[model samples]
Each structure stands twice: as C-alpha cells, then as structure tokens.
Target: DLLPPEKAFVPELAVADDGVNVRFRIADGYYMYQAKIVGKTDPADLLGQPSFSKGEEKEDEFFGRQTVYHHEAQVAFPYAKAVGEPYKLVLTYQGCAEVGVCYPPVDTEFDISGNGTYHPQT
Candidate 1:
C-alpha cells in the first residue's frame, strides 16, 4: 500500500531575512530524486543556487543510475536583494514510492519574508 503524494513526501518551507529554507520529510520506502529538486524566486536574481546535501546512490529501474534522498533532505536558497525586497518562492520536485509508484513533478509556491510567510516591511 502507498500513501498520497503529500503524505509520502512532505515539504515544509520557510524564509529568513536573506534566504529561503526547505525541508523534505520523505516517508518510509519513499525517495526523492535529487536532480529533480529545484528552487526559484519571482524576480529570479534575488534567488541563489539551492544547496542540496548528499544522498544515497542507487541504480533505479526507471532512471538507470542516480542519487536519491531518503528520510530527509534539507536545503537552503540564499537570496540577495534584487529589484524586489522579497518575492515568491517556487519549488519543483519529484519522488517515488518503493512499491512502484512514481509521482509526477510537483510545483509548490510560497511567499517569502522573515516571518516565514510574506508580509510588507512596515
């Protein structure tokens, strides 16, 4: 039996004064494809390269060979002040269940601010 996409791979997003943070709590027997994980910002330039930690190396039936994240993967998207003081964050990622279900690519968006959710600076 397999769980739904949200339950199988939970992505919690937060933003700091200068950057964005993401944590994926992958379910048991489920793994996320590292290369498929991407982070972005609305203005584009404000967003920096997201750093992904190392993951397990495995030969996948669908992708041949690749690096996969299990259990948890935490990443950060450092940002610089571009035209916009703060902007939108878009995350694209994909995962699969060990039992043979491959989830479609996902695109989740969020507003960015120091308070985790977006707000205009007073």
Candidate 2:
C-alpha cells in the first residue's frame, strides 16, 4: 500500500496583503490533479479562484486527459485584507499514487492572521 494522503502531500499556506499562497510538496511518486484543486474562505468572498502553476498533461485510459502536478503545486489566490483578520481558509485537493491508487479529495483549513502568517499541515 502507498503512504497516507497526508504523508504523500504536505501543504503550506501563507497569507499576504496581496493574496494567499497555497502550495503543496508532493511525494516523488505521486501527482495531484490540477482541475480538482479548489479553495474557499470563511467570509465567502475574500478570495477568488486560484491561479495555479504549470502542470504536465497526463492521459490515462480510465481518467482520460488531465493536468497533474509532479513534485510541487503552487497556487495563488488574489485577496485583500478587506474581509478582516483571522479568516478561515479552506483548501480542497486530490491526487494519486504512481502505483495506481487515486486518493479522494482532501480538505484542510488554516487561520490567516497578519503579516504573511503561515500555517501548514501534513
């Protein structure tokens, strides 16, 4: 069996005045589906759709055409401080192992306070 979902993808979140950084360091033999990545804020309108990094296109018989990230996935969401401090940011993502097991979408949360505060989970 492959490693746990948390172990396979370690996520790092940072909040800045300009936007929020949602990045993940994926294990060597694992990849994350680009289209399946999503983010939301507690206030609901604090953040917009994230701009993701370049990913490689992969084709599988079962999954068809999909963009996937290998090694790392970095996304930026344009946000301002107007929504106030200590907002709850939730992230949803999905990935798969090279051995063929695809993990379900995983959701994680972070409390963003001030001055580019970073909160990560694994």
Candidate 3:
C-alpha cells in the first residue's frame, strides 16, 4: 500500500548561475509538509531562502494542523552566484501518503551549474 520515499515524492532539481529551482512531483494520494522543507548550500551565503507556494491546510495525528502540498511542490532559491560556479545545494524535505503513513525526510542534491541545467526525473 506504499512505495519507497523517493518514488512517493520525486524531486527534480534545476540549477543556474543566477538561481536554483527545485520541484517535487508528488504521487497521487501523497502530500508534502511545507515547514518541513528546507535547503542548504556549501558556501552558505551563495543561496538565499526559498519561496514556497501556499499549500493546503491539513490536520494529521503527528503534526496536527499543518500546511501540506499535493500534486507538485515548487521552490525557488535566489543564488548570489557572485561566489562563482561549482557551488553545492542540498534540499531536505518531508511528506506523507494519505492512506496512513508519513515518510522520512528526503535529501536531494543540486550541486552542479554550468549556464543553468534543467533536471527532470522519471
């Protein structure tokens, strides 16, 4: 009645010299926790806070009332790029399946950027 964490919520990362874009393709009946999502960079200062879309309100047993996302979760991180290329970005997020299970946090990497690359996962 469940799939692996990665299959449940797949994250696609796109990197650019000016910014970074991360999109999560959430499976049907699955949702992601908004506040539980965050990111960090190697140089730290090179990456700014991400802007997330307003998600749906949910009240679950574990976290109680929370903002969760269904379908897709998109995040944008403005990059200073002034530090130059080759910076590393790691995205950590959490989600759950509506049936009755919450998965562990997922960590995805976006550590490469050469004139911006679009990463689309299957």
Candidate 4:
C-alpha cells in the first residue's frame, strides 16, 4: 500500500501583503521534483516564477537530472491583485516514493479568500 497524495505531500498556503506563499510538507520517504512545481492564480498572473528553497540534485533513471525536495519546500509568488479578493490558486507537482515508484503529475486548486493568512488544503 502507498500513501495518498494528500498524505504524501501536504500543501500549506497563505496570502500576504506582498505575495502568496506556497509550502509543501513532504513525507519522510517521499520527495517532490523541483522542476515540476508550478503555481498560478486566476485573474492575475504570478509576477514571476515561484522561488523555491534549495533542494538536492539527483539522477534518476526516468527523470535524468533533477532537483528534489525532502522534508519540505516553500515558494513565494507575487501577484498584481488586491488583498481580500477571492481567487483560485492552481498548482501542479510530481514526486516519488523511496521505494522507487515515481508518481504522475498532480494538479490541485484551492479557493483563497485573499488576505495575510495561512490556509492549508487537504
């Protein structure tokens, strides 16, 4: 048996005065591929690419050269929207288990009532 996406990679989000914060609580034996991470919001495009923390470089048979996050990963994306605005956050990512099973890409969305607050998605 394998852990579900929610258990394997928990997503925590928050909207701040300047930008949106995206953090993932990766499971102990699982890792998320850095290059596969994508964050976006409706109405206004992300100011730039999401800036993530440093990850480890690894070579995999299926992915070739790639960087991956272990315990956690955090990224920030600035937007051109006002606070208190209701927006949708769409994210896409992929990861694999320590058992050598690579998972397919996962696309998820969250309803954010924009403000300087953190809200985690299950």
lDDT of each candidate versus the true structure: 0.78, 0.83, 0.79, 0.81
Q: What TM-score number comes out for model 2? A: 0.90
Better by lDDT, candidate 4 or 2:
2
TM-score of 3: 0.87
Error of 1 at 33 (Å): 0.4
| Model 2 agreement with the true structure over 44-114: per-residue lDDT tens digits | 87887789899999995547899999999999999743756677888899999988778889998887766
Q: Runs in model 3 with CA error above 4 Å?
A: 118-122
The estimated TM-scores of all candidates read 0.85, 0.90, 0.87, 0.87
lDDT (Cα, tens digit) per residue for candidate 1, span 84-107? 455677788999988877999988
Worst 10 residues of 4 by lDDT: 113-122
Candidate 4 stretches greater than 4 Å from native: 44-46, 81-84, 116-122
Candidate 1 has a TM-score of 0.85
In angstroms, give how far residue 78 of model 1 lies from its true place.
1.2
Position 4, candidate 1: lDDT:
79
Clashes of 3: 0
Q: What is the lDDT of residue 48 in candidate 4?
A: 59
Best-matching candidate per lDDT: 2
How many clashes (backbone N, Cα, C below 3 Å) per candidate? 0, 0, 0, 0
The digit string of per-residue lDDT tens for model 4 on 1-122 reads 68987789877777777887788999889999999999877755744578788999988767899998999988888766455667778888998998889888998887777575555455
